[PDB]
Amino acid sequence: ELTQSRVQKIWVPVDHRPSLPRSNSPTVIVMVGLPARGKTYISKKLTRYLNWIGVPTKVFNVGEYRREAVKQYSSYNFFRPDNEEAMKVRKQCALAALRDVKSYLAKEGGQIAVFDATNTTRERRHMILHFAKENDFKAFFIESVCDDPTVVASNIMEVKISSPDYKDCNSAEAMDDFMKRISCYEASYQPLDPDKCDRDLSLIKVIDVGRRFLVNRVQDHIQSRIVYYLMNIHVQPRTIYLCRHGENEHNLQGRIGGDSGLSSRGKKFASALSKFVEEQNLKDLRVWTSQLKSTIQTAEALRLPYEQWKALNEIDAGVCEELTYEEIRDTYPEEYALREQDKYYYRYPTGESYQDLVQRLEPVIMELERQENVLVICHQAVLRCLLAYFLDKSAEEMPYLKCPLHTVLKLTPVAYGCRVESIYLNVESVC
C-alpha cells in the first residue's frame, strides 16, 4: 500500500500512524590563501551553485565579522603580525564565525558551511580541523594560489578599492595599502602540502586562475561535485543573453506547452532578435535552443549556427499539456490550487516540477560556465530556473521571476556576481 504525495507526486508507504504518532555529515569548506586570491569570489559562486542544485550552503566571511566588530578600517597596520590586539580581534572573529558555522550545520539544517578567511598557517587550520572533528563535521580545503602580479592587481581594482574598508580612499592609495596588507601574510604563509604534511586532508589547490589543480582525498559525492564545478569555471568576462522563443500560437490561445510554431508577432521578434544580436557586435557568439520548434524558428532568423538541447525544453505539464489555464481550473481545480500554494515543488501529474527542471538543467549550467558569449533561446519556466542560478534567487522565488515574451535578459559579471539588464525588443505579444 503506497499513496502518491499530492504536491510532488512521490509514491510513499501509507503511514497508518499508530494512535501516538512518533517523529549524512555536514561539511565545512575551509578557504585558504593570501588576500586577493579569489577566496570570497569562489565562496560565493560555489554557494550560489550548491544552493541552486538543492544543497543548503552558507558563506561565513570572517572579514565581514571583523568589519562589524571594528567599525572603520584605516590601514594595513591592522593586519601586521606584530599587532597583538588586532591578532586577538581577528582570532575572536574567526571563533565567532565558527560558532555560527556550528549553529548553521548542527541546528539550522545547513549542509555546507563555507569558512571564508585566509587560513594561511598550519596552526589556524589545525584549530579548524579540531573544531570540525569535535562536531563530527567533515572538512574540505580549497586553496587559491596565484603569484601572477597582473591578476592580483586586477583583483584589487575590481573588488578591493570599492570595498567599504576603503570608503575614505582613492584608488592609488587603496591599492598601495592592499599590497602592504598582502605582504603582512607572506612570512607565515604555509601553503597546503598534500605530498607531505597535508597528506591526509581532503583538498583542492586551484593554481593560476584554474590552469592547474592539485586534488587530494575526495571523500564523498558532494566534494566530488565541488571539485568538478571548481575545475570548470573561469574568470574571464563574457555575456549571457537569455530570452523566450518569439510568441507562439499556443501563447495566442492561452494553451500551455505543446510544440506550436511562431505566430506572426513571434516572427517579428525573431527578426528584431536578429537585429539586437548584430548591434551587440560580438566576436564570437554561441546560440543554444531547446528541441521545441518555437525556439528553433527563433534562432533560424539569426543566421548563426545553433545547437539544440533537449534539457532546455519547457517544463512538461503532463496531463495539463495543451490545456488553457481556464480548462485547468475547471478539470483539475485541486491540481490548480496545489500548484498555486507550492509552485516550486509542485509536479504536474505525469509531468514536471521546477525542481525537476533544475536537475535537467545542471549540465546546461556546467557547460555555460565553460563558454564565453552565449545566447540561450528557451522557455518561460526554463529561463526562470537559469535566471535564479545567475541571480542567486531562491527556490521559493524562482517560479515567479519576471520573464516576459520578446525581452532579452543580458547578464554581465560585476564584482562577485551577475548584473541583469532587460532589453525589450519592441514587438507586441499576448500577456
Place this chain on the structure above:
Amino acid sequence: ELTQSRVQKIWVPVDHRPSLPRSNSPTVIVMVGLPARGKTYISKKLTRYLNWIGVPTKVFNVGEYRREAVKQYSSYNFFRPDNEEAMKVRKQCALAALRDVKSYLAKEGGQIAVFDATNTTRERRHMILHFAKENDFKAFFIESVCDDPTVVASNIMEVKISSPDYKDCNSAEAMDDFMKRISCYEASYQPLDPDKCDRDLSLIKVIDVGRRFLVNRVQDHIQSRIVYYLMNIHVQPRTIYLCRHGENEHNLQGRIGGDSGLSSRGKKFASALSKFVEEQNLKDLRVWTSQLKSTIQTAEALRLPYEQWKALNEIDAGVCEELTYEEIRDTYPEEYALREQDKYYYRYPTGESYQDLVQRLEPVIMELERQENVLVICHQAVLRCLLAYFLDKSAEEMPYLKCPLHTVLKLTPVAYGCRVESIYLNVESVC
C-alpha cells in the same frame, strides 16, 4: 519553414535542395606509465564510457600490435633497453599504431583515439606530440603513478599471469618475469612534469589508485568530461544487481508505460527478490529505484532503505503511453515501422528515444562508479541502457538486450570489464 525528422523528431530547416544537391579537432589520449599501472584498464573503461555517451572512441594497444608482430613471448629479455632489435620492433609497433590512429580519426569518423603504451620517455612523447600537431589532433596525457608494491603485485596476478604472453608459464615464474620487465623501464622513466618541462601539456596524473590527482590545462569539454570520469572511478571489487520492477498490471494488459502497480505475481517476485538479497549476505547494500510505483513497491518488500531517481523512470512513450502494441500498430502504423528499423535513435512523438535515456542516465552511471554494492530496481529500456554501458554493447544492439521480468542481472568485475550472471527468481510473469 521547419519540418520534424521522422525517426528522431528533430525540427530542421526544410532543405528545398536546388536541382544539383550539394553535400571540432579529434583527440589523441596518450597513456603514460610503468607496466602494471592500470594503463590498459583505464584505456578500456574510459573508452567504454565515451562510446556509451556517444563519443566514438577506440583503444590502440601497442602491446597487442607487438603480440601480433612477434608471435610468441618468452621473456622480459625482449624489453631490455640494450635490446636493439626489440627496440626497433617496439618502435615500429608504435608507428603502426599511430598510422591506425591517423586513419581512425581522419578517415573513419573517430573522435578519440586512446594510444595505450608505456610512453615513459620525453622523446617518445615528443614524437607523439609531433604526430598530433602535424595531423591537427589534440593531445591529452593520462599518467598512472603507483609505487605501492601490493597494488603492482595484485595487478600482475589479476591481469598479467593469465595474459597470452605467459601461456607457457606458471604463476610464480610469470610474476618474476613481469617484475624484471618493469625494472627495464625504471632507469629511463621520465614522469610527466607539469610544474616545469610539461607546463604546456594537457594532462592528468592519477596517483596511488586515484587518491591524488594533478590536472594541467584542460582545453575543452571532452577533456573536462574525461577528467571528471577518471576522478570518480575506483578499483575495489563490488557487485551491481539490476532488475526490472516485479510484473505490473500494464504488463498483464500489454499496455506500455504508465505508472501501474504490481500484480500478484509482481509481488511474489518482490518477496523472492527479498530472499535473493538476503542470501547474497552483503555487508552494506544500496538500493535504488525509479519514481514509478512498481519499482518502489518492489523495493518496499526488501525492508532496506532505498532512494528514488527520476532519471531511472522508464522510457517515455509520449503519445503511445498506455497503449497496447496492437493499438500502436493500428493507430500509428508509420511510427511502429520507423521504430522497428531504427530502434535506438527513434523517438516516440512527444516522448523519448534510447538515446535520450543514455543522456538522462549519465549521472546514474557516474554515481554507480562511486558506489560499492548496489541493487538497481528499474525498467526494461533503462536496464538495457545500463547493461550496455556495463557490458560494452553498442547503440544498435542496446534496445534488443535480453532483460526479462523477474530476473536479476548480477555484474561483477573480472580483469578489464564486467561479467554478467543471470538469476531467475522462479516467479512467472507475462511474456
